[model samples]
Target chain A: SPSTGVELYLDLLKRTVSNFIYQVAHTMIGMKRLNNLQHCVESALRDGVPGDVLETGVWRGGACIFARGILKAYDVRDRTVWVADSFTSLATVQRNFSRYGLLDDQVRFLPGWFKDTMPTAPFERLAVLRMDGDSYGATMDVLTHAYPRLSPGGFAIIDDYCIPACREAVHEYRDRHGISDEIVEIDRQGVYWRRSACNI
Target chain B: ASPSTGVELYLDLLKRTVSNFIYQVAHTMIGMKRLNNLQHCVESALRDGVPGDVLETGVWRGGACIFARGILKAYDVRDRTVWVADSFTSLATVQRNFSRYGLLDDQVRFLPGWFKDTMPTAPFERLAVLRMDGDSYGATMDVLTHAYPRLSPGGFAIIDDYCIPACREAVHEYRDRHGISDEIVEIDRQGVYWRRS
Candidate 1:
């Protein structure tokens, strides 16, 4: 062991070098929930689910963006990617679409606040419905307006579900619909559940 | 809007809303300041929990990248990384500039190589913010397509030298080739920017 000084020293140095970067290096990180959520979309796509991918509370459009990545990755062409947001003051939601190099026809921007737009959205069906809206008002509004549009076996993820107000909205809305599916946690902050396997 | 006793220096930059404030501040202070519009984009991404790293390519003295890192620290963002790629050398050298790396801050990766070599090979999980300032058409185009695939939904792509026709040519050409329909936002007269919807 004492004979291999050069090799041992180089080994120790590189091992130490990579340690710090890897400590903070995250894979499929961020609020991304990249693997689970994208797999959820992929599963539906495999089952030949008919509809689109959508998210409410898509401010700066992260969750919805991930949703769109799923669409793009699968090369799923027929369905559209819907990015819904409250009136965007911090960043331009509609404008950011071009940066990702996705198509206009494949992506739809729903601009108004949830209360204003969800109730009147012209969408027909959803393969995945993600709720990032943090407030009770916005959360409740999208569920009431959009939950009915989620196709059978499609998923609903709440990025704000761990928050008290958002959790309350999920429960209240679920109770109203007699929707008893067990909600699943995505990472530490979000919750998701598929619609009943059959038509509601 | 000024007090009668004192006057503020305002160079009407390119005849519009933005002044020489950015230019002067960048020189005088810590290598840079951001356009208000780009700041809004960065602020929004952090606040909304966009899931990806934030980056600035062709960082000059790590200025804009420093600003990008500030936002990450301000948000106390632990789940993400900040990538700062810069040649950090004179353009004539056309090569690497490996300055201080970890000292920039925690959760930051210091890549000291030209965009042509560094960006395409970057270990990018995803990009929520991309700020470009290589200042040449080739550099602009290299960063645009090389980094574009990984930019998150609703992410932003900012070109610091939009006033330069060469940079604009690369951007417009890329956008047109890729069917980018987002309007080019005038962050200032010189700093044309855009966001990915």
Candidate 2:
């Protein structure tokens, strides 16, 4: 039997190690946003929710990398990740520059109009959805297409919810679709909704 | 200023702020042995003639105060006063920090009050080192404006959560607003200090 202090220290050490491993993975893969999303996914997984994972905007593929890591860590083999992006930048919409800045030719932002750039599907089972499309229209389009496929007790995280227009779109879509899932805002930016298992 | 220059400065400030914010969050969220480290630092600073009067803006469980008393005892500084200020109830990240340090003690003179109300009237003189660990910008700035003027010459003021962006922003904004040019030195990744001239 380990002493209480030693046990607590060991537990903290394990968490620290996990945090370090996550940080290393994020740094090497150039996925800074994964740091925030990892916590959300980890908490949900710990709560025993099951669903496939999805990322609408997979720039540099950081969020997806961590999503895969979460699945592997939990040993959940039945999840599939649906990565949706135009694989190219969208033209200046009314709400574009305010949130994500004007589309630049050199930035090589995942184009919003091209479907060929979206990651190939056939993921194990949909548990998480990470959306990062900057425009309200682009974000709504992705939600309308993907919301039906999300597993029950699955998470759909909207990254651009911090932007006023993006949040408005989420609200409008939820209301329009009559989706009654509880929406949780974490770290004041990321908004996630958990689908009921009965609905899945 | 040019648009590019403004953007660069804004980005630099943003980076520094974010880094500091992360430290504040980590300090609050993670149960680290920071109080012990803080006590050690205070002891070392005191040994190097840091000063006599001790003050902490946000005293949760009074562990730091107890530590200060220990230092005073060890150094044979009988006349020094240790002023501990807090609302008694923990606020924001201070609760987490207090729990980690296990500093709750009944013996310490618990100033059952906020920094804004308590700092102005706290009984202390010949101020040597003032430690500001208040979590919010408003509280920290209030303490600085009210208490910093009275800090003795060559005395040091340590601002906890200085590495956090909100606290750092408040410090910079306050420094600029007050037209005070005291040199602030980063003592650690999380601690910042300024010595009175």
In model 1, residue pairs whose N, Cα or C atoms come closer than 3 Å (at least 3 residues apart or on different chains), thus clashing, are A95-B195, A96-B195, A96-B196, A96-B197, A97-B196, A97-B197
lDDT of 1 by residue, B1-197 (tens): 21111000010110011121211112112212344454577778877766678877765444345445434444446677778777763432211211111224457786777788888889987988888875699989989989987988788888888889999899989999999888777765577667787
lDDT tens digits, residues A29-93, model 2? Answer: 22234555666566667776666566676453444444543444344555544445654233322
Q: After best superposition, candidate 1 residue A195: deviation in angstroms?
A: 1.2
Candidate 1 at B195: error in angstroms? 39
Top candidate on TM-score is 1
Q: Candidate 1 at residue A196, lDDT?
A: 79
Q: On a 0 to 100 scale, what is the lDDT of residue A175 in model 2?
A: 87
Model 1 chain B TM at: 0.74
**How much is the lDDT of residue A178 in candidate 1?**
88
TM-score for candidate 1, residues paired by index: 0.45
Docking class of 2: incorrect
Off-target runs (Cα >4 Å) in candidate 2 are: A1-200, B1-52, B89-108
